[PDB]
Amino acid sequence: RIQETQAELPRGSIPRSLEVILRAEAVESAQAGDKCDFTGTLIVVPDVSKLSTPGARAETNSRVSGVDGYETEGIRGLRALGVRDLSYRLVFLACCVAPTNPTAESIKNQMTVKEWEKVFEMSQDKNLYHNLCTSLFPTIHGNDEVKRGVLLMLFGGVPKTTGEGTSLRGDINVCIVGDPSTAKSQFLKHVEE
Amino acid sequence: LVKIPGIIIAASAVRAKATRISIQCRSCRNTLTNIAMRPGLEGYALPRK
Ligand SMILES: Nc1ncnc2c1ncn2[C@@H]1O[C@H](COP(=O)(O)OP(=O)(O)O)[C@@H](O)[C@H]1O
Ligand SMILES: [Mg+2]
Ligand SMILES: [Zn+2]
């Protein structure tokens, strides 16, 4: 199942939902929560309980009439002429699925030479501690402690397990309490973006 | 349609043949009426339902 994104919403409208079908190799990809582009076809599939009122329907061209004792009444007449209700729904078949915007060895191999050059340039800078604070939060004034804490939470720690069957946390949790208008929701919005 | 001469040597008795028939149901006593029979030496098969 896929959903229309927020940027495509018109005034006062709920996002549209659509069904996508994957066949064979393309079945693997497109996990839940992703934001992806699809390329394929738009195809019509029949439906059953759409018509509570009579609508378009099919029949046979043969000019056949009933005989006494076998008169083409309701049920028998409909079954004899092969009448089917024409109901339909729209379904999308996908042949290509891609990310809208795109195991350490695998990550290293995926990156190109220029991307790896940029990564290495970033790696050996002490100002990485400072510049990352200003880059993610350019407009918010002060509160550098909160920026450092949020960056540390983003990078996170290492999880471990012990021999007795217990487990140890590797994640970090952060709480912010403040007076009104102290840019408290701006950090949340920036991290969401 | 054909035209043929001949000499008649045998003639059976005059009998009765039905052209319109009506039948009745055993249980609800409903009726089917005014069923047209075919001319000539042709029969008719009663319905079952
Ligand atoms: N230190 C700051 N630097 C820049 N803008 C600020 C700062 N403090 C407050 N603001 C502005 O004031 C508003 C604060 O509202 P908000 O952060 O939603 O308050 P709260 O999160 O406490 O409900 C924001 O729109 C923000 O633009
Ligand atoms: Mg707020
Ligand atoms: Zn009956």
Curated annotation (Swiss-Prot), chain A:
Q: Which residues carry this modification: Phosphoserine?
A: S13, S65
Regions that span the bilayer: none
Give its localization: Nucleus; Chromosome
Q: Which residues carry this modification: Phosphothreonine?
A: T72
Q: Which domain of life is it from?
A: Eukaryota
UniProt PTM comment: O-glycosylated (O-GlcNAcylated), in a cell cycle-dependent manner.
Question: Which residues are recorded as binding ATP?
Answer: H141, S181, T182, A183, K184, S185
What further fact does the record state? Answer: Early fractionation of eukaryotic MCM proteins yielded a variety of dimeric, trimeric and tetrameric complexes with unclear biological significance. Specifically a MCM467 subcomplex is shown to have in vitro helicase activity which is inhibited by the MCM2 subunit. The MCM2-7 hexamer is the proposed physiological active complex.
State the similarity comment.
Belongs to the MCM family.
Q: How does it assemble?
A: Component of the MCM2-7 complex. The complex forms a toroidal hexameric ring with the proposed subunit order MCM2-MCM6-MCM4-MCM7-MCM3-MCM5. Component of the CMG helicase complex, a hexameric ring of related MCM2-7 subunits stabilized by CDC45 and the tetrameric GINS complex. May interact with MCM10. Interacts with TIPIN. Interacts with CDT1. Interacts with MCMBP. Interacts with DDI2.
What's this protein's function?
Acts as a component of the MCM2-7 complex (MCM complex) which is the replicative helicase essential for 'once per cell cycle' DNA replication initiation and elongation in eukaryotic cells. Core component of CDC45-MCM-GINS (CMG) helicase, the molecular machine that unwinds template DNA during replication, and around which the replisome is built.
- List the protein's name: DNA replication licensing factor MCM6
Q: What is the lineage of its organism?
A: Eukaryota, Metazoa, Chordata, Craniata, Vertebrata
From Swiss-Prot, chain B:
Regions annotated as coiled coil: none
Q: Which domain of life is it from?
A: Eukaryota
How it assembles, according to the record, is:
Component of the MCM2-7 complex. The complex forms a toroidal hexameric ring with the proposed subunit order MCM2-MCM6-MCM4-MCM7-MCM3-MCM5. Component of the CMG helicase complex, a hexameric ring of related MCM2-7 subunits stabilized by CDC45 and the tetrameric GINS complex. Interacts with ANKRD17. Interacts with MCMBP. Interacts with TONSL; the interaction is direct.
Q: What's the disease link here?
A: Meier-Gorlin syndrome 8: A form of Meier-Gorlin syndrome, a syndrome characterized by bilateral microtia, aplasia/hypoplasia of the patellae, and severe intrauterine and postnatal growth retardation with short stature and poor weight gain. Additional clinical findings include anomalies of cranial sutures, microcephaly, apparently low-set and simple ears, microstomia, full lips, highly arched or cleft palate, micrognathia, genitourinary tract anomalies, and various skeletal anomalies.
Q: Can you tell me which family this protein belongs to?
A: Belongs to the MCM family.
Q: What else does UniProt say about it?
A: Early fractionation of eukaryotic MCM proteins yielded a variety of dimeric, trimeric and tetrameric complexes with unclear biological significance. The MCM2-7 hexamer is the proposed physiological active complex.
The free-text function statement in the UniProt record for this protein reads:
Acts as a component of the MCM2-7 complex (MCM complex) which is the replicative helicase essential for 'once per cell cycle' DNA replication initiation and elongation in eukaryotic cells. Core component of CDC45-MCM-GINS (CMG) helicase, the molecular machine that unwinds template DNA during replication, and around which the replisome is built.
Query: What's the protein name?
Result: DNA replication licensing factor MCM5
